[PDB]
Amino acid sequence: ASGAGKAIGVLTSGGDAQGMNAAVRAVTRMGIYVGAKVFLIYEGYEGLVEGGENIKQANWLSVSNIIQLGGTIIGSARCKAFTTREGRRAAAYNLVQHGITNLCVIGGDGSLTGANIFRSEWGSLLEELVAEGKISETTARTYSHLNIAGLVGSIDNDFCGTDMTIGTDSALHRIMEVIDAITTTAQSHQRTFVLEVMGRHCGYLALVSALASGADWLFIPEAPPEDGWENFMCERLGETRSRGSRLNIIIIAEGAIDRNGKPISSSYVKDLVVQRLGFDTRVTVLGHVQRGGTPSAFDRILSSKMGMEAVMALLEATPDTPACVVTLSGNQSVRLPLMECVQMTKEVQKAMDDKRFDEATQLRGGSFENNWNIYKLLAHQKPPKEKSNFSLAILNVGAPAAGMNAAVRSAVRTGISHGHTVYVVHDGFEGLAKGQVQEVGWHDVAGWLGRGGSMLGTKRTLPKGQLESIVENIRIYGIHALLVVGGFEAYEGVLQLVEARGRYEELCIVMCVIPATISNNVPGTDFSLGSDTAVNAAMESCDRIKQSASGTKRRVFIVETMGGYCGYLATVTGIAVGADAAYVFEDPFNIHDLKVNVEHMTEKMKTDIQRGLVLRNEKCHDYYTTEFLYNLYSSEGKGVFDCRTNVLGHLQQGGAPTPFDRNYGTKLGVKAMLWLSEKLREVYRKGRVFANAPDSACVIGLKKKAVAFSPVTELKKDTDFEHRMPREQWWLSLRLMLKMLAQYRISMAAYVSGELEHVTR
């Protein structure tokens, strides 16, 4: 099973997407965990060409304390030698001199194209190399096959076969930090903010940025503006002013073009707006800022997971299997052949070269086209000449979660677009009982994207107590559908209403649960809306806490995280921050395990790593509290390290939503409203709605691959109501990666890696 006797090469090439260091760390630490020799190739294909000093064998401490660093400690370089066979043969020679039959390439589309051409010629290169006399025929029959596992490390997301790439999320963090500087201020005078992103080839960053910020206008190369857009844009900004909206946002990609090949410059749009509107227009250009900063939490977890799966795919790969790219489509890990992804990239580039240009956007991926349609729909209120008698109420229940507002905004706009009479109820089920029901318009949710917490009130109160009041108000307002955006209490309350359909006719209405909670404890989803924000806030505090010991001082920090009994937040934060241990409820631990972990920490602190960090979920243990672990670690570490405690309380809660959470809540809010409208049409009968099947009350998912609708009655089997969490949680396999990355010898035979899948046309 183990990959002993074989060596793994890891290199980074292209633009230094932040989170590359997390991928390199995971690749290295998996390769020497399984016994393989790991060789670090510095400067990418450059050091591959020159070789020699640029190829060094890695130890466990070679990738120590790099996970929080952006860029790449390995270094990346543009080399033209790898383009030509003269340098590529030298690269093959230097790999053979170290017995490196396994190569992991972390880079963009050009990097992976070079890796594909390098595999395709590996046999021919070895033949020409032995022919020229630099390697004997023996020692060339071995190493006859080169194994390539690709990792898409780039901010562009231009690699067509893959949905999400390393560094895209963090580039979005940089972009939205800049936009939030503008939008969160008390907007005082009429001004226009024109943001220029570096999406020269791919406009994905421009698109998701526009969606996350609610941009008034978007210039992306995939969909250039129609002729006469000059007037159309200026009029849009004009009515925006007339509304009283004091700030317009124009997101213009670097690759912005018109229907011809002529590029549209940010300076042109600036001067255009200034001339016709007179708004204070200034162009903000990020430039290098997008590649900068720390990697986001998402980037660290996903880079670590993909780097691990890249190594594992590189050991189980026989001479026959092709070069693969380890990526995630949705939440599911998958391997795609490198050749097909390169071919699709070439097809989209040719299409974008005025071949099938209007039909190139679909080949970019369904996510791009769907994102652009959602953006345009939510941007400007088109007239819904269609009307329907249906009327729906949007609830916010439970704790506040970052991204509830984004979900409610999208739900309101999409429902108005379908002609529904959208109500919003303040304080969730309490207001539904008390009749705090307010008909909502398009502009009533204006600017709700970036606001954290909940504009609508949240209450944890379940509907069972005031069930008579709830059905009374449903009858009064004629609420045909109920959109409940919230945590476990949202799901549990919808479950109580569905169970109470037996008693009350008025509860025979279509219900939908959007899981939105910090704990990520809602059954029927992988990511509750706002768990990403909490994880990012948690790691930032943990990185700060870890940064506080300096120089010589050897100190361990016990950090207590929230999340109730659900350990998700603790474990992922421990992965993102390189925590030594993340004690959670789902992995019960006794004093024997504690002494093991403490002695492990002590031995580690005698090495050159000096800042240990262990996370404690708040409800992992009844007796082994944070004070208990403080006392244990400080006593046993006496004379080796000091121990300190920090309970991250509500520092993980009130933050503004991360860009992932905004886009996520935006999209599933749209999808929830699409599903609500489809189910209401499917269920309208005899002049009324009568939703009484269990599939008419569902939790909107994202369960493995795509968005799902799991009926609440079906989820009740797999729900631990006492602990308020699901019985089977997808993330428990990540404990194995955490423990592996902290030198804990854990037989991870229970970990399942994504299998090969062909590209979806």
Identify the residue among 248, 531, 653, 729 touching ligand FBP (CB under 6 A).
653
Amino acid at 66: I
> Can residue 480 be called a binding residue for a second copy (CB under 8 A)?
no
Contacts of 517 (CB under 8 A, 6+ apart): 398, 399, 401, 486, 487, 488, 528, 529, 530, 531
Are 242 and 188 in contact by the 8 Å Cβ rule? The answer is no
| Least distance to ligand ATP, CB of residue 16, Å | 9
Only one of the segments 146-154, 185-193, 516-524, 596-604 lies at the binding site for ligand FBP (rule: CB under 6 A); that segment is 516-524
User: Cα(251)–Cα(240) distance, rounded to whole angstroms?
Assistant: 16
User: What DSSP string describes 377-403?
Assistant: HHHS--------S-EEEEEEESS--TT
> Can residue 109 be called a binding residue for Mg ion (CB under 5 A)?
yes
Backbone φ and ψ for 684, nearest 5 degrees, come out as -65, 130
Which one of 156, 216, 299, 427 is the catalytic residue? 156
Identify the residue among 9, 403, 450, 563 touching ligand ATP (CB under 6 A).
450
> Can residue 685 be called a binding residue for a second copy (CB under 8 A)?
yes
At residue 410, the 3 state secondary structure works out as helix
What is the per-residue binding string for Mg ion in 89-108, x denoting contact by CB under 5 A?
A: -------------------x
In the block, tokens 């109920």 appear at: 482
Backbone φ and ψ for 417, nearest 5 degrees, come out as -60, -40
Residue 487 to residues 243, 456, 639, 668, Cα–Cα distance (Å): 35, 14, 45, 15
The pair of three-digit structure tokens given for residue 628, joined into one six-digit string:
């208990």
> Can residue 717 be called a binding residue for a second copy (CB under 8 A)?
no
| Least distance to Mg ion, CB of residue 204, Å | 12
> Can residue 617 be called a binding residue for ligand FBP (CB under 6 A)?
no
Q: Looking at beta carbons, which residue is closest to Mg ion?
A: 108
* 124 annotated as ligand-binding: no
User: Cα(424)–Cα(498) distance, rounded to whole angstroms?
Assistant: 20
Restricted to residues 471-490, the positions that interact with ligand FBP (CB under 6 A) are 487-488
User: Cα(152)–Cα(236) distance, rounded to whole angstroms?
Assistant: 38
Amino acid at 263: P
Nearer to a second copy, 296 or 696 (CB): 696
> Can residue 502 be called a binding residue for a second copy (CB under 8 A)?
yes
Tell me whether residue 550 is exposed, middle or buried, using C-beta atoms within 10 angstroms of its C-beta: 0 to 12, 13 to 18, 19 or more. exposed
Backbone φ and ψ for 394, nearest 5 degrees, come out as -105, 120
| Least distance to ligand ATP, CB of residue 13, Å | 5
Are 292 and 18 in contact by the 8 Å Cβ rule? The answer is yes
* 31 annotated as ligand-binding: no
Nearer to ligand ATP, 17 or 315 (CB): 17
DSSP 148: E
User: What DSSP string describes 299-362?
Assistant: HHHHHHHHHHHHHHHHHS--TTSPPEEEEEETTEEEEEEHHHHHHHHHHHHHHHTTSSGGGHHH
Are 373 and 364 in contact by the 8 Å Cβ rule? The answer is no
Nearer to ligand FBP, 71 or 655 (CB): 655
* 685 annotated as ligand-binding: no
At residue 288, the 3 state secondary structure works out as helix
At residue 365, the 3 state secondary structure works out as coil
Only one of the segments 77-85, 260-268, 448-456, 499-507 lies at the binding site for a second copy (rule: CB under 8 A); that segment is 499-507
Identify the residue among 262, 686, 758, 761 touching a second copy (CB under 8 A).
686
Nearer to Mg ion, 256 or 629 (CB): 256
Cα distance from N-terminal residue to C-terminal residue, the chain? 34
User: Cα(335)–Cα(329) distance, rounded to whole angstroms?
Assistant: 10
Nearer to a second copy, 125 or 698 (CB): 698
Task: Answer with the entry of Mg ion, ligand ATP, ligand FBP, none that 113 interacts with (C-beta below 5 to 8 A by kind).
Answer: ligand ATP
Identify the residue among 141, 503, 650, 727 touching a second copy (CB under 8 A).
503
* 300 annotated as ligand-binding: no
Restricted to residues 102-131, the positions that interact with ligand ATP (CB under 6 A) are 107-111, 113-114, 117
* 266 annotated as ligand-binding: no
Restricted to residues 238-277, the positions that interact with ligand ATP (CB under 6 A) are 245-247
User: Cα(119)–Cα(125) distance, rounded to whole angstroms?
Assistant: 9
> Can residue 491 be called a binding residue for ligand FBP (CB under 6 A)?
no
Identify the residue among 183, 521, 602, 729 touching ligand ATP (CB under 6 A).
183
Q: Where are the alpha helices (DSSP H) in 316-359?
A: 338-352
* 652 annotated as ligand-binding: yes
Identify the residue among 11, 49, 218, 556 touching ligand ATP (CB under 6 A).
218
Identify whether 156 is a catalytic site residue.
Answer: yes
User: Cα(171)–Cα(71) distance, rounded to whole angstroms?
Assistant: 12
* 345 annotated as ligand-binding: no
What is the per-residue binding string for ligand ATP in 83-102, x denoting contact by CB under 6 A?
A: x-------------------
Identify the residue among 358, 505, 599, 627 touching a second copy (CB under 8 A).
505
User: Cα(717)–Cα(579) distance, rounded to whole angstroms?
Assistant: 33
Only one of the segments 170-178, 468-476, 511-519, 675-683 lies at the binding site for ligand FBP (rule: CB under 6 A); that segment is 511-519
What element of type H or E holds 33? helix 20-33
Contacts of 749 (CB under 8 A, 6+ apart): none
* 365 annotated as ligand-binding: no
Amino acid at 193: F
Backbone φ and ψ for 352, nearest 5 degrees, come out as -65, -15
* 200 annotated as ligand-binding: yes
Identify the residue among 96, 562, 570, 734 touching ligand FBP (CB under 6 A).
562
The pair of three-digit structure tokens given for residue 494, joined into one six-digit string:
């919808």
Task: Answer with the entry of ligand FBP, Mg ion, a second copy, none that 108 interacts with (C-beta below 5 to 8 A by kind).
Answer: Mg ion
User: Cα(365)–Cα(342) distance, rounded to whole angstroms?
Assistant: 14
> Can residue 399 be called a binding residue for ligand FBP (CB under 6 A)?
yes
The pair of three-digit structure tokens given for residue 86, joined into one six-digit string:
């003269």
| Least distance to ligand ATP, CB of residue 3, Å | 27
Task: Answer with the entry of a second copy, Mg ion, ligand ATP, none that 694 interacts with (C-beta below 5 to 8 A by kind).
Answer: a second copy
Restricted to residues 174-213, the positions that interact with ligand FBP (CB under 6 A) are none
User: Cα(583)–Cα(735) distance, rounded to whole angstroms?
Assistant: 10
Cα diameter, the chain: 89
> Can residue 42 be called a binding residue for ligand ATP (CB under 6 A)?
no
- Rg of the chain over all Cα atoms, to the nearest angstrom: 27
Q: Which residues of 111-139 are buried (b: 16+ CB within 10 A; e: fewer)?
A: bbbbbbbbbbbbeebbeebbeeeebeeee
Identify the residue among 70, 108, 564, 578 touching ligand FBP (CB under 6 A).
564
Backbone φ and ψ for 434, nearest 5 degrees, come out as -80, -5
* 591 annotated as ligand-binding: no
Binding-site annotation, residues for Mg(2+): 109
Task: Give residues in contact with Mg ion (CB under 5 A).
Answer: 108-109
Task: Give residues in contact with ligand FBP (CB under 6 A).
Answer: 398-399, 487-488, 517-519, 521, 562-564, 653
Task: Give residues in contact with ligand ATP (CB under 6 A).
Answer: 13-15, 45, 78-79, 82-83, 107-111, 113-114, 117, 154-156, 183-184, 187, 214, 217-218, 223, 225-226, 232, 245-247, 376, 379-380, 446-447, 449-451
Binding-site annotation, residues: 15, 78-79, 108-111, 154-156, 191, 198-200, 254, 282, 288-291, 460, 517-521, 555, 562-564, 618, 644, 650-653, 724
Binding-site annotation, residues for ATP: 15, 78-79, 108-111
Task: Give residues in contact with a second copy (CB under 8 A).
Answer: 501-505, 508, 685-686, 688, 690, 692-694
- Hey, which residues are catalytic here? 156
